Amino acid sequence: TTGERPFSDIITSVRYWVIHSITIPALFIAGWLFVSTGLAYDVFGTPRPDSYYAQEQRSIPLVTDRFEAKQQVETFLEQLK
Amino acid sequence: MEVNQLGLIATALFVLVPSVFLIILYVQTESQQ
């Protein structure tokens, strides 16, 4: 009623699936490779399963200063994660 | 001063109940015509 093609007309068209059988798997593969290559860990700073603790430590790398919190995180990561 | 604690509530009700009774009667009198 608003001047756009109805969704039923679009998603049942062959042209839509010609486009989207390429675009949708490409985005799925992109996200899969974003995780599986480890780029997500680097982008977001999420610890790997071997990166929560140093080998013999059981304390938690908690930031305790507001303005050197970036330096505290870098120091924690420098300690073999 | 060691006064009766029920003194406050007694005086308050002694003022309030007859006063609001009279106010009820006056306001309903004014709304009649």
Binding site: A30, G31, W32 | -
Partner: protein
């Protein structure tokens, strides 16, 4: 007849493209071992 790229197209794709990307990411996460 009908225009292809509209406001509705933009809203739909700004919701759908990151959704499929994130679904692929989480599907990859399901096979991560510690």
């Amino acid at each position: 007849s009908y225009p292809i790229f509209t406001v509705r197209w933009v809203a739909v794709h700004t919701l759908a493209v990151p959704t499929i990307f994130f679904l692929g990411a989480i599907a990859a996460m399901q096979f991560i071992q510690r």
